[PDB]
Symmetry: D2
Subunit: 251 residues, 4 copies
């Protein structure tokens, strides 16, 4: 409680699944939150389900939209004050090998998963540096930033890019005394309403050869490690990878 | 607050520096703690400085002493109840290259840093498995588990051994549904009264070529990530490495 | 000698520095080589300096040009036979932090360093699979695929993407018994005529805090590890990272 | 051919399997070799099967025997000249979880796999430094230096220790301009007469969930990467990990 007192957070893809859980715990801990998403009717209902407009609001945004990132920071500023916290959580996945990826699939996945993260990090540094905010940029990666999957080629590429680009930004902010930290969070398989919509998916994911615990995780498993990284508890952590994956990458 | 409600923790080397901070935060969050150390007068005073005997007690133990590990678990059991949490934090360091390490230095450093951790992990699994405790074994490693240091040969070996042996134990517990998690924590350079006792040490450690933040950390920086791993917030994390190092291993 | 007997290799960016050394050793060991580059006068002179047209030829190509990759494989096929070996070595670097990267710099660097590698790998698999060739795709990464550099943001992102996308492709080829291997090579700082053109560069690179050997390497240091990976000596290596960096990433 | 001209190599555990293949290729490439082993009748027959006493000889040694390491270097010196190359390849394995490891199993496995490597590396540096030899210490690790196995607890610990202790030694030698390199080699599952002696072993090892290639490797797969590291081709590689594992650690 009150672990995120005074923080102002943006969370991209914050209307569903992982990102909505992070938003929920960020509010329980005293943060003010702006969540983004592509659809207004889902996003306004999501934001109302968590709290009141003095706590959490919704902004319609495609994270691949460069100019929209500026509007998003302005609106959060106008609504809640200077932003201290950015969680680049919006992503999309394509189920193709490298061999079978079309160039339109490639470009479309990188625009969201890699350009978007770049645009959010670049603008985050510019807007949060040198303000005594205890600023933190949590860049959502995944186990596929560590290990390959034969059927997630373009995804593997985007999550490996975000893993190492985040270490570049972390160093620059640390060396220039910007008072910004940058870290990546790497979920394993997490249960979400989307997974529930794929018969047998969670079953395949829960096999011991994939997830040693024999089950998959839940959205709050990721929300709790983002709380830690958003708060001043983690003021000495930057450039690091935080894995919550049920044992996946240990074997 | 109350993030560690009901937990029973042992912390080795818990009378000083990092381990005493972990003990302190473990008590603030509702855990019952037994700290160990080699000297009674320091350990009884340390334990009294944190709280009352219903909260925290001291047990005299050298972590390289196999038979003493049994006494330690029994006494914690008798005092506080079944143990749910073990932090293998006791260690010693030798400032020698591999070339200049004597065999007595080698054996003496491995008895504490590697045998001790083994004895604590082995007995932890045996005593905590299959009890619905939400058991967690936090094995203290360090950045020297990732990267070499020309003047910490035997240390590098012990912290690399603990890094990978902890992943073995994590898998076995996960696959056998033991309800035990095992993880490693890797501090960078941390300020402790011992460091303060070395003129110019912290100065050398704080140089940007070592620690990009330009400063070193503090004991609570490690206590907060142990709280996270001791609690049920991290129930989906096992076999993973958690680095709090100011950027050291990012460059 | 004759370690690359019968192999047919494409090497992108093969007219200069690292890529020209790889081409040279590939020819000394019995491979037939096609090198690419952006300028005909340099590329025709480079190719003539190594050997005769029955051994090595030049093809004008920008690796970011998708359609040109098809022409390149056809022409190599027509000239030398079925391709067994692809070295995605062409790259460009931008000396900017993430904070100071413009979007045109970002896109331009990713088109060469990441799209290009994708196009070469995707087409390599399609053209080399299932032909008993002992096919090998060596994807040129660098130490910046492992660690961040505060002034190479977009570069770090491209080399982290190539590191993990190569593991995806390696698995798919292995699981489908394609007889293709995919691996990444990670040079540290290497002396090239370009570096010689930056007064004080090599001096800054050779400092012990960067390169522990106190010097930087030479192009042949990378050519010898590509020989190993192009040949059947490495038929059990796939999805792995091979680092030749003077100690850079060890500390 | 002649890639190891003038080199003088010791290979521990060099009478069988992996180590005997390394010895064989080291001789084919012009090196003089001393192999060690615990049994004279196997070791003298092995050494005779490779070549004549001017090329390769056998020395009876337990690598856990400190004082014997001195005799071994002296005898190689007397027989072949100053040693340039050490391959710490002798090891033993115990098939137990951390939970089920007895302390005698623990100590016995660490004496060979970790003390032995220490003794060989420490004495190697002392005897090979500053002699213009192009000295190379190849420390045999394995995939279990990267990832855990639920039934190889003490093994995981020894191979993680050797992975990181080798980086310490590599840095010290590089910084002091000793003309010694230190690297680790990490085989995956390799077919040896011992494996052939376990019905169904290779079958279990060759499953795609373990080894993506669907088969295991052969001893020469490790011999060829040791050739590369023993020779001056790799003069810019130190502190690095070289993995030949069929894809095991890529997924
Ligand atoms: Mg480093
Ligand atoms: Mg794995």
């Amino acid at each position: 409680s009150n672990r995120l007192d005074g923080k102002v957070a943006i969370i991209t893809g914050g209307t569903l699944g992982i990102g909505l859980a992070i938003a929920t715990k960020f509010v329980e801990e005293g943060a003010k939150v702006m969540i983004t998403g592509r659809h207004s009717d889902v996003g306004e209902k999501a934001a109302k389900s968590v709290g009141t407009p003095d706590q959490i609001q919704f902004f319609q945004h495609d994270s691949s939209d460069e100019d929209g990132w500026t509007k998003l920071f302005d609106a959060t500023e106008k609504a809640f004050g200077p932003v201290s916290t950015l969680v680049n959580n919006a992503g999309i996945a394509v189920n193709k090998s490298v061999e079978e990826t079309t160039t339109a699939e490639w470009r479309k996945l990188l625009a969201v998963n890699l350009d978007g993260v770049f645009f959010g990090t670049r603008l985050g540094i510019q807007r949060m540096k040198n303000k005594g905010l205890g600023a933190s940029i949590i860049n959502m990666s995944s186990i596929e930033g560590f290990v390959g999957d034969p059927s997630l080629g373009a995804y593997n590429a985007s999550k490996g890019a975000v893993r190492i680009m985040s270490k570049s930004a972390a160093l620059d902010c640390a060396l220039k005394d910007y008072d910004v930290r940058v870290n990546t969070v790497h979920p394993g398989y997490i249960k979400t309403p989307l997974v529930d919509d794929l018969p047998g998916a969670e079953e395949a994911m829960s096999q011991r050869t994939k997830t040693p615990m024999g089950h998959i995780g839940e959205p709050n498993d990721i929300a709790y490690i983002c709380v830690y990284l958003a708060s001043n508890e983690s003021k000495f952590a930057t450039g690091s990878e935080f894995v919550v994956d049920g044992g996946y990458t240990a074997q």
